[PDB]
Amino acid sequence: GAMNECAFGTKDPVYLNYHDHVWGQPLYDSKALFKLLALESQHAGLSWLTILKKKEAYEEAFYDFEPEKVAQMTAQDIDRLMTFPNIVHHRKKLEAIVNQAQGYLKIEQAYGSFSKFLWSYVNGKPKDLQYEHASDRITVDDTATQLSKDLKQYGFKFLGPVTVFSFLEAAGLYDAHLKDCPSKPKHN
Ligand SMILES: Cn1cnc(N)c2ncnc1-2
Ligand SMILES: [Zn+2]
């Protein structure tokens, strides 16, 4: 039915729990948003479920994505992570998270809150994309393109427009659930 169409055809409870409890569900906590963003940056070349299943390994490797701690990681820390089990052993991908954490800190210095910075891109409330079929879905748009360009100036890496669009859907700044999906959030 609708949930199958909405949730990328999966019957995996890990992915379904993610669909129901995280994906497209508005998230306002700054450190939690950073986490989703950093995980999205690890996707390219792999399946998304692959990254999802590596989440706990990443949390251990990156101090539960606490940006103050991640931003201080050294080349020697990355050397160590290249053989840490069950994260993606892609050196630029791992280095990118450290750079992202530095950029988060710069944003917070200028704007107070990474969450307030991000939510501004949708005027403070979730944009319902109003999809009816999975075939309606696009992979990038103007807002994601702008946010991608803007993050670069603060030192974020591995976050192109398509990747940022995926993050907006995941964080619930965009609601990409189908109209009849039982997990579609209510809006006001
Ligand atoms: C298919 N899919 C579902 N959820 C996400 N967060 C994703 N990121 C990249 N691709 C994704
Ligand atoms: Zn859904």
Side-chain angles (χ1 to χ4, degrees):
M3 203 193 186
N4 186 285
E5 196 187 346
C6 188
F8 314 94
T10 194
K11 292 174 174 70
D12 191 324
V14 166
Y15 203 1
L16 290 167
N17 290 345
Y18 173 78
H19 193 80
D20 187 50
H21 297 298
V22 179
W23 194 76
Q25 320 296 336
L27 178 65
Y28 299 98
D29 181 81
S30 291
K31 288 183 186 167
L33 285 161
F34 175 73
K35 181 164 165 182
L36 296 190
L37 186 64
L39 288 171
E40 299 288 339
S41 78
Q42 304 297 285
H43 170 253
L46 301 169
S47 80
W48 174 248
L49 190 48
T50 294
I51 298 311
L52 275 190
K53 292 192 171 180
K54 291 181 186 297
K55 179 173 176 272
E56 289 73 24
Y58 272 94
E59 282 160 353
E60 178 57 34
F62 289 98
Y63 303 100
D64 191 31
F65 293 90
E66 176 85 9
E68 187 190 302
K69 283 162 201 159
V70 175
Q72 297 174 15
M73 293 171 82
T74 62
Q76 293 74 24
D77 290 328
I78 303 296
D79 290 342
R80 177 177 41 78
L81 290 191
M82 290 297 299
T83 56
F84 184 83
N86 215 25
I87 61 176
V88 182
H89 299 134
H90 184 304
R91 188 172 186 118
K92 287 176 89 151
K93 278 183 176 178
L94 302 180
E95 289 172 333
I97 292 173
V98 177
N99 290 129
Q100 293 160 13
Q102 290 161 358
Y104 170 108
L105 298 175
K106 303 178 210 175
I107 286 171
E108 290 220 327
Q109 185 62 22
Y111 297 120
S113 166
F114 187 63
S115 177
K116 292 188 197 319
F117 176 84
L118 290 176
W119 277 95
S120 182
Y121 284 80
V122 294
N123 196 37
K125 80 154 177 187
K127 178 163 81 183
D128 189 348
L129 300 180
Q130 297 184 280
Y131 295 146
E132 305 215 9
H133 311 290
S135 64
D136 292 340
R137 292 209 181 115
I138 66 183
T139 59
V140 61
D141 71 1
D142 279 14
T143 290
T145 293
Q146 194 66 55
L147 179 51
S148 176
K149 295 178 189 177
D150 297 340
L151 291 174
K152 285 203 187 161
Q153 301 296 130
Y154 301 99
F156 289 76
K157 295 212 185 285
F158 274 72
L159 293 164
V162 170
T163 299
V164 172
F165 185 90
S166 292
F167 163 77
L168 296 170
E169 298 174 306
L173 281 76
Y174 280 8
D175 172 7
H177 289 269
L178 309 188
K179 198 174 67 128
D180 294 335
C181 177
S183 294
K184 188 178 177 70
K186 182 111 167 198
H187 297 287
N188 216 42

